Design an enzyme around this catalytic site. Structure first.
Site, PDB file in Angstrom:
ATOM      1  N   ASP A  35       0.737  -0.655   0.220  1.00  0.00           N
ATOM      2  CA  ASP A  35      -0.091   0.172  -0.057  1.00  0.00           C
ATOM      3  C   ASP A  35       0.923   1.082   0.045  1.00  0.00           C
ATOM      4  O   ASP A  35       1.711   1.511   1.037  1.00  0.00           O
ATOM      5  CB  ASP A  35      -0.825   0.212   1.259  1.00  0.00           C
ATOM      6  CG  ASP A  35      -1.840   1.437   1.199  1.00  0.00           C
ATOM      7  OD1 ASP A  35      -1.851   2.195   0.968  1.00  0.00           O
ATOM      8  OD2 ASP A  35      -2.082   1.541   2.059  1.00  0.00           O
ATOM      9  N   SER A 199      -0.972  15.719 -12.619  1.00  0.00           N
ATOM     10  CA  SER A 199      -1.081  15.131 -13.064  1.00  0.00           C
ATOM     11  C   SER A 199      -0.859  16.896 -14.336  1.00  0.00           C
ATOM     12  O   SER A 199      -1.513  17.204 -13.787  1.00  0.00           O
ATOM     13  CB  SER A 199      -2.022  14.539 -13.080  1.00  0.00           C
ATOM     14  OG  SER A 199      -2.945  14.027 -14.569  1.00  0.00           O
TER      15      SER A 199
END
EC number: 3.4.23.22
Length: 330
Positions: A35, A199
């Protein structure tokens, strides 16, 4: 040193991925969920409340000649999905894919929430976010990656998740056979303890690319892609009959649909998520309503590039003094 381990979807939807991890001496092999959005290595154990164990493999520290109680240390964690676990702490030898760390904090669960009990395939979590998020008190502990780092050939690990297939976690090296083209690196903020990046925009299907900054985290422990409501609405508007269902808890679509791809930007590069990756199948067994793999982050407080996004790429988690995040097509 390096390590390389195969990661396997737990079910036919790729809801999560499990990777075998050796703990203790002799080795006890547990299948952990790696994770990158948390920082605790915790396991089902001989200490876990018996009614909360249902088919998991447990770690028994009393059977490990290298286990030592980390006296006074406790831990307690709550995840974004509302699940939780807590317990006490041992140090022990932990190996992943041939890479060994001595003295790793192994957080032994005394209590786990129902979602963990109900998932027989996941024996615990191995956190790969920054050690500043580790929950051990009163002495915060390091992740497996942070403990391994100085020994590694390069201070990196890579995630290469499969679509409905096994993939690979590598530590200490970049497998140049595992991706196509070049790797585009992008800046990381560690201010919240995550692999947080920005992004450069998105496109829906064959649509034009929209240049827009989307801050979010690279999180292998989250199944879906959680993005701003504007972006998500733009995607599902291209699917006839898709709608946001408050009763189901997100966007659903007709199971008869063919989904468009979703592209996200990494600097000037583009990662394309095929439409099939966005199908999470019937909302309930036999339903003709299917659950979408792209959902709004509006109720989270962060955008999350979860498995839906990451499994479309070869992802480099660069833990150099200035961390960065690399993405390649594959």
């Amino acid at each position: 040193s390096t390590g390389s381990a195969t990661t396997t979807p737990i079910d036919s939807l790729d809801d999560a991925y499990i990777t075998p991890v050796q703990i203790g001496t002799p080795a006890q092999t547990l299948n952990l969920d790696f994770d990158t959005g948390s920082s605790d290595l915790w396991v089902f154990s001989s200490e876990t409340t018996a009614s909360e164990v249902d088919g998991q493999t447990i770690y028994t520290p009393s059977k490990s000649t290298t286990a030592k109680l980390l006296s006074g240390a406790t831990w307690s964690i709550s995840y974004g999905d509302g699940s939780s676990s807590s317990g006490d702490v041992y140090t022990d030898t932990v190996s992943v894919g041939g890479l060994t760390v001595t003295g790793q904090a192994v957080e032994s669960a005394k209590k786990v929430s129902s979602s963990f009990t109900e998932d027989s395939t996941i024996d615990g979590l191995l956190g790969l976010a920054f050690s500043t998020l580790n929950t051990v008190s009163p002495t915060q502990q390091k992740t497996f990656f942070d403990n391994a780092k100085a020994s590694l050939d390069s201070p990196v690990f890579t995630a290469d998740l499969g679509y409905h297939a096994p993939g690979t976690y590598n530590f200490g090296f970049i497998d140049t056979t595992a991706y196509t083209g070049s790797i585009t690196y992008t800046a990381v903020s560690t201010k919240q303890g995550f692999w947080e990046w920005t992004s450069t925009g998105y496109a829906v299907g064959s649509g034009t690319f929209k240049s827009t900054s989307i801050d979010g985290i690279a999180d292998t422990g989250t199944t879906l892609l959680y993005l701003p409501a504007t972006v998500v609405s733009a995607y599902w508007a291209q699917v006839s009959g898709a709608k946001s269902s408050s009763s189901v808890g997100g966007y659903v679509f007709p199971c008869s649909a063919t989904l468009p791809s979703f592209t996200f930007g990494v600097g000037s590069a583009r990662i394309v998520i095929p439409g099939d990756y966005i199908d999470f199948g019937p909302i309930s067994t036999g339903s003709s309503s299917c659950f979408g793999g792209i959902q709004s982050s509006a109720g989270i407080g962060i955008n999350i590039f979860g498995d839906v996004a990451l499994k479309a790429a070869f992802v480099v988690f660069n833990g150099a003094t200035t961390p960065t995040l690399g993405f390649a097509s594959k």
